[PDB]
Amino acid sequence: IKLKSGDFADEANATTESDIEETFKRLVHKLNKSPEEVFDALKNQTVELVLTAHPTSVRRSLLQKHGRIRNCLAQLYAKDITPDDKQELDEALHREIQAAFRTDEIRPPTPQDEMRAGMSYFHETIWKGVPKFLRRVD
Amino acid sequence: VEKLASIDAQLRLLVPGSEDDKLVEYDALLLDKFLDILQDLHGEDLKEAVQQCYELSAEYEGKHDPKKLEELGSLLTSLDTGDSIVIAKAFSHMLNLANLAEELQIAYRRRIKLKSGDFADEANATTESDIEETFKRLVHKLNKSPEEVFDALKNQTVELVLTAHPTSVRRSLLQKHGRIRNCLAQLYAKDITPDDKQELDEALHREIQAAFRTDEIRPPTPQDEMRAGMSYFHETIWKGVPKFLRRVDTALKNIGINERFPYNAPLIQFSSWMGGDRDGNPRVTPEVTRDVCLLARMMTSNMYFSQIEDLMIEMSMWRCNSELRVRAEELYRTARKHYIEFWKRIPPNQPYRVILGDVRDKLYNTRERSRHLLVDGKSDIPDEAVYTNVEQLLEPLELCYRSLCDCGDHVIADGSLLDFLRQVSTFGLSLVKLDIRQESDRHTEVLDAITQHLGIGSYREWSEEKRQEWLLAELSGKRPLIGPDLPKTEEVKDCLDTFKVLAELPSDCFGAYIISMATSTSDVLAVELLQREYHIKHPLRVVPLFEKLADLEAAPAAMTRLFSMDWYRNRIDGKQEVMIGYSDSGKDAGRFSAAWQLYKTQEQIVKIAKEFGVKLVIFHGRGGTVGRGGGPTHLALLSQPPDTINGSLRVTVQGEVIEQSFGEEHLCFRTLQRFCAATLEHGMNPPISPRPEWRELMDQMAVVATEEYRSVVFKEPRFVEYFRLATPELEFGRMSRPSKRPSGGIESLRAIPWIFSWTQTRFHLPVWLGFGAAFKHAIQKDSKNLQMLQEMYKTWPFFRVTIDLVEMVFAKGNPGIAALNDKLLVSEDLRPFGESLRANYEETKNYLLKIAGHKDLLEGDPYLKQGIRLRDPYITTLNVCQAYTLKRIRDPNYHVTLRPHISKEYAPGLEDTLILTMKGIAAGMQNTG
Amino acid sequence: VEKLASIDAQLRLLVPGSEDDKLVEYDALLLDKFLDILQDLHGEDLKEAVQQCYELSAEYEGKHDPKKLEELGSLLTSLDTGDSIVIAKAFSHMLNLANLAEELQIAYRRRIKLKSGDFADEANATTESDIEETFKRLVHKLNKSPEEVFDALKNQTVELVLTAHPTSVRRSLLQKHGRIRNCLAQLYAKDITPDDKQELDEALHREIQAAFRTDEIRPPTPQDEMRAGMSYFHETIWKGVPKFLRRVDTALKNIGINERFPYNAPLIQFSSWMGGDRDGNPRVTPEVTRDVCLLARMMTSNMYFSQIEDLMIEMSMWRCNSELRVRAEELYRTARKHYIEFWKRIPPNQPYRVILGDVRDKLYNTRERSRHLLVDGKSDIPDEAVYTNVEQLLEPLELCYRSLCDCGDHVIADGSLLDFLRQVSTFGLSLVKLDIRQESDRHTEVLDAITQHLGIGSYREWSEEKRQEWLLAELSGKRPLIGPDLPKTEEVKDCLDTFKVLAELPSDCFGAYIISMATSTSDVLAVELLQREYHIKHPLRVVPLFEKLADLEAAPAAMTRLFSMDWYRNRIDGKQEVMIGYSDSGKDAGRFSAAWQLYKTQEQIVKIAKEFGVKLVIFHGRGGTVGRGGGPTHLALLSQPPDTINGSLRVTVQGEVIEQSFGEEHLCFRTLQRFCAATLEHGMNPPISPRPEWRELMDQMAVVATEEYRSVVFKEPRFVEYFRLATPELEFGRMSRPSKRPSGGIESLRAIPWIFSWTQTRFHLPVWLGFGAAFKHAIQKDSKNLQMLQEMYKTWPFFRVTIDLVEMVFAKGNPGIAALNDKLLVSEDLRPFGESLRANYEETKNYLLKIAGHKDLLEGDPYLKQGIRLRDPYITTLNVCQAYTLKRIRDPNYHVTLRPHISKEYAPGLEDTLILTMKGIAAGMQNTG
Ligand SMILES: O=P(O)(O)OC[C@H]1O[C@H](O)[C@H](O)[C@@H](O)[C@@H]1O
């Protein structure tokens, strides 16, 4: 949403919540902080995310299939897309679902593997995510 | 290649920019095209002169450097009468363009899809509820059945009373405004050819010029001023109404009602003051009133007539029920044409056409009788040949309609035929009904003549109890009061003749008789008696308008007494309408105290009507939050005290708002929409009632505000000299109508002038004065009040709506203009008095902000703010031009070196330049108080 | 949720689908909405019956299983008269829908951006050249200066002659077709609300039903049939022309001409046969002709009149030149109103309005005089009060125009005023000029009466040389030929009275006097003489129409002789028009030999006119490639022999093509556009001249083709019995007008009937017969001819255009229908004769393919093919229904078990069902021969 009520309720929903710039601006304009003070607060801020193990947790292979499926799907919905590319993305999609469905072996796994799991999600997303976000801060 | 991108760039600076936000582009293009035109017609030299003014005004609007204002002064004041006229025209015309662009932007701005559900959402067009959403809220959030909603609606009436523009535009020029707005709309459509673009370009360029060159120098008669109106209806409302009612139909489908809104349910009704309101206005004679009825009757017949021919073509069907087939045969049988579409006879082979042909002739005749009556005074044309009553015109249409359904063709019947039924039913034989308004003292003058001529003393000298006793006696009198040989002053004759006119004309021409400056039971009986004297068969309902605060405080007693009288209870037949006027009452006691008092008065009068079994309608005169137009009207209506609408809304649509409200089909539609939706919702979902703490604080603030307002306006003896100097008020007073009802003083001055004078000046005193004292005193008495005030702004619609309006005005305000005025026009001894008022402006504004919880004006409403920021430079140029012109007019010996004449070409004076200026500013400011 | 996606799915099967290709969706929606309507009105049961027929026809159109056709037969033939009427209406109505959808698809299909430059590109709307592209080609590819192009154009005339629909639709029903087409257009626009969609849906649904229920059972008078026309012009051409001329203006900008196309340059002119053509048609009396002139005059005045009021409102300007200011003063001075917009007097404050008010009154009067003359016969109204000549009406508009420019407002002057000037100048006082046509033998009959009554012998008995000698003598005779007391048969009186009518009426009503069945110099002189006898002040130009091949071969000698006569050379004043008729000539000798002969005849007559200093105009009668409408017309015009247009085009717009060409604003515009562009290009860029080998082969093929055509049609004695049986020709002949000029035989039968009979039947014999013999013989004589023929198809526009038309017809052909017909209607002894013709169909088609280098019909033109494939199932159902109906009519004793009645509701027979059928098929087939 482009114009937001300004109520704190807006921050409970992804479509209305504030991104970093809007937050800075609220702080500067609605709260009389100088850019320098905000920048300074931020420079000294730490956010630590502690990752716990899935209480039931999924395979690095299967993750990537989930990703491939999610991308195929994302791509099928784009204008300026050929009958052929659509046809080929279709079979790509169809194929990657099956590949996931057929990755279903019956087993316990060691803490080492359960953790070697983690080192995936970071590869997959956080490792690239962090620079992207910090550049947005910039 | 590109003048535009630069003009766009320099327009963006004024308001930073986004998606469907084309306003700056729109304004840029229009401005760029308009400049070229100035160049062609008046020469490079002048074009630059115009740009310079703009650049300066814009530079000023950003920083607010009083230097810029002076540079602007040096420029404007150095122009001969000829060139200043041109600049004044130019800026005055760029404004109208900027408004069209804004109409268009507003029309196509995207609705927000998911809404908070807060009542605040109803104050803005993007977030407010359409009719379906309203139905759904009522059904789901409020446990009403579809049937109950449908039922409420079926019984609901919404009456919009049209008043004359207080400065008003030409039917030609309207249509140019439309054409320009359409060309513009069309230039922004994808899948558009280079050629079509090129051709639309020149179409646009051409239509701006055509408007610019429609600028002749003038007064016009009430008849023409009204014949104006009959345009806007053609242009937009006539079509709007069916479109909206069809939407009601669709909305009813979607909540599970499987039938259309009855075509004869009088949901929407229109009315007018034009030729009706004679309060402090002797130009509005009886003959005027007779003429506006006949015009209305005529034009309406003409409208029905010019579209009947299209319905006739559409109605090519031959399968009908017998009821119809008979009546067709009859009509062909009775046959043996001035116009041409169907200039022939018609085979009963096609019966629907036969009926509609008769209808056409009857409509033509009805048109012609009204035409001859209007120009001759007699007309040799039988009532048989003509519609004297709307039922007569509906009947054949209902016939066709039924026939179609019966033959299995309801689907066809619900097309144009239905639209036509709805039009007929909404607009009747007279597009608008006319209200009559005259001030109480006049009826007194008349009765006094009568009593004195009868030898029984002086009605004027009698006490209220006596007047009532006498009036009731004569209301059952067994012999007339009035002879032909009664001595009459011109005023008394004028007043009595108005009743002769009311008796002679068909009653479907008229609405209410409003009594201006009402104060008592006798005031209303007086009018009842004179109606009886003239044996008016269907007397108009009498509507007191209570203006001054005291008159408001006395109203309940007056209404109670009325309702206590059997004579009266039985005449009004369960229905009373009372009028109120925000501007009027606020001229007496300040806007704040007037707002609050009106809330309470309505509450009390509602309670009183309830007790006596009377359905009470409150007619909202001008000045309300409720006459703002746009979304704010939506919330304003929902903000009304509980049970004050009760299925029947009646509101003034102020002339200075008719364009915004109706001039563009989408806005027209949404205007109609919100009036209908809000009215409906309110009866089933009133706003919360104020907490007693709030009443208590509001009462406390009212006293202080009224004290401040009166201190400054009435008590301070310097004030009128200030007003007379700092303000074009005197010059306005050499006009619309006498703005002083020659008595002297502000209490004597009428409200429109009062509001208008200070609007010209961008200072707006009448709207905010007293809010500051009230706020300051309440906070200084107790800092916890700030919290209370804020809770009130957050939670109490009335309060919110009341503060938003004042906020909007401050956004259109600029005290620098007021300051310049002081410096140019006001004597050295009165400047500190001005400074003092500007100080109060600021302090009031700041409290108002603190209460709404905003840093800047209109944080809640960026779109509105953008609209204003864009208009401003143009207005500023007019203010400045105006100020110096006022100087030159007032001071025969002020002179400065004039620049050699700048305009080319290939008698007018200062007064003309001033008018241009007064009208540009007024159209840039739209509504305020 | 979804009947539609399925109906879409089953419609796709018929033609595989893409981008802006909405046709299948459009057709699907329309069909789905139409079915619901059949359900509401007639019941599930019937709806299914209709679907079944469709499913069968569709299944048939895909595979071509004769079984399907029979299943369909079993169904259709088992329906009582009542139900078959309904099905016939239904399919006949789904066709009209399918055509609207196609109009819309054609209107919005995307232009190709980069074009090959081949002349083939001009045969298709997506690739053909608009006016600007044409200018540019001429300037850049052909070294013409802008000035030369502009100049050519300024002198160019394009005359479109409108003929009556050979079966013609109602002004009401047109407008429904428009409304349906618009609702549809609107349903496909993004940024469209759920509500608007919902409401447009019901609007659509409603307007289809309204059309479906406008279906009353009939003959109508020439007057009404013509009063039809005055619709299409209102609807589309009246507005179209200014729109196009403004595009010409824009196109001229973009090649550097800095002025607009002169508003009085007669670029576009319209004409009509309605009430004019009396050839083999005694219903078209003199009185008819007098009436169509007066109607024309009336309605035209009315059109100018209903828009003047809008121009008057627009012309609010007050600044004028003196020339105007005088004339305004004069007019206000001379003042002291039936209608209402301006029912008042007007201040000279606004002078443009004063003029235009006068103009309005004069237009009204002109309307009224024509109205009274029309219904009474006298009218007491002075020529002074009225426009008797277009200059009189232009003058005040030119005045306003000039005034505006002079005051600096040309930009405004080039808006509606200009459009109005252009309309006036294009349409004059009579929207169309009327051509008169009568057959030569009639003039002979008249002259014979005269000569015999004079006692000098028998004009009929005289030799050509004698007739000429006598005619010239009497053309300079010193005393009248004709007494009031001359013995006259009804025909001779009818013919003579036509000239009395031509003399009495204003000459701006009339165009040409066409002589049907012309063959000689005397034929034209005869008409000249009778015009002199009736002292017609401005005689109409005489235009021989040479029909039969022999008559074409003799035409050059006849024209040469005419041009040799001083009497004649001096009367025609440098200008001769000659008519030709593709269908007519092709009825004599086959389409092929007629095409070729007409190429040569034009060449020779051009050469002959050039030699005598005569500007020759060739009036294209019906049947051409050039009367196809759409792009193909574009190339057809460019394909004409060199110097045959020379700045003046005159072509018939066949009734069965007027809807496609004009009924939709975009197609209207492009029709006008290509006619103007092609005409312009041709005079500066003729097609290549045929190589002598090509002439030689074409001559050789012509003989063979004519031999085959005549062998089958005239020489074979079995043919007429075949025709009479295999074809609704006889039943058509109990109607428009007598299709046999009672003489007996094909040579006697008129061409429209000839074409139409075989079109109904999907077999189209008149269009292709003889092409096969010609092709086969040329290839069998020498296989290298195939190559030559192909080079001709690739390189010779005439040839290409000639083959494309025949190809298009084969695409609308289906020999199975012809085969079914044989089996149902034709006796056992004639079936092998049918088989033989079907064999010739196939063989002709296959050669035609081999020559165009296509595997399948219309490879070059998928869009056209798609249009046809979609229509077909509907047509097929009509063919089958038709066939059995023809059986039941012809055979009182053929009966089959009728299904119990299927339609519900909530006197008609077979003949009625047959008409429905004849008209559905005809509207599905549009133009062929
Ligand atoms: O306000 P006045 O100067 O009396 O002028 C006219 C106006 O007056 C009142 O306030 C009424 O409430 C309005 O319906 C009207 O437009």
Ligand SMILES: O=P(O)(O)OC[C@H]1O[C@H](O)[C@H](O)[C@@H](O)[C@@H]1O
């Ligand atoms: O062809 P006919 O049966 O004579 O009927 C009328 C037609 O005839 C000719 O071919 C003409 O060339 C046309 O302008 C006309 O539409």
